[PDB]
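Page header: ASSEMBLY MODEL / two components / 196 residues total.
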Amino acid sequence: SVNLDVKHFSPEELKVKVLGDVIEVHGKHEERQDEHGFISREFHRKYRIPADVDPLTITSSLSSDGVLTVNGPRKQVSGPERTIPITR
Amino acid sequence: XXXXXXXTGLSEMRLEKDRFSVNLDVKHFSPEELKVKVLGDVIEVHGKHEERQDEHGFISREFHRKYRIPADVDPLTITSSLSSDGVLTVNGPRKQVSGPERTIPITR
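Prediction written out in full:
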């Protein structure tokens, strides 16, 4: 579970990709003119999924304040609220 | 929370009787990963951050910026440097005005 500021990038411009044990956020601009001049920008941020989550249970969403969140549940294998393997 | 292509940093411009100057916080880039292109009437500032480690996993960045050269500034003598703390700067010495021409013949 993790959060990243993306206010600099459009929601449409922003994309997230998950592959096995890794995550990849990617963004890009087109020389957008701000008060100081033209500002082209792009980046790639990555993360590793902890064993408490899997690449099929993950969720991704964006708040209006400009913060992207990558989320997943906590896999309780022992104690109360025990988990059960949903089979497809 | 993690951050990306932040530039809380911001660029600033100043004008004085001696020279023009513009600053850019590059706290996320090294001198070999940055390059400038003061075109005839422009001052481009680019950076290509490699896929290196950060406080959270690894991160990559790349960016282009463009500033326009003001009047009485010769692109031939514009200079640039990189202050510590992660901030670059472009200094463009300025000149004074000339005569009123006195050579503007007109037609009918």
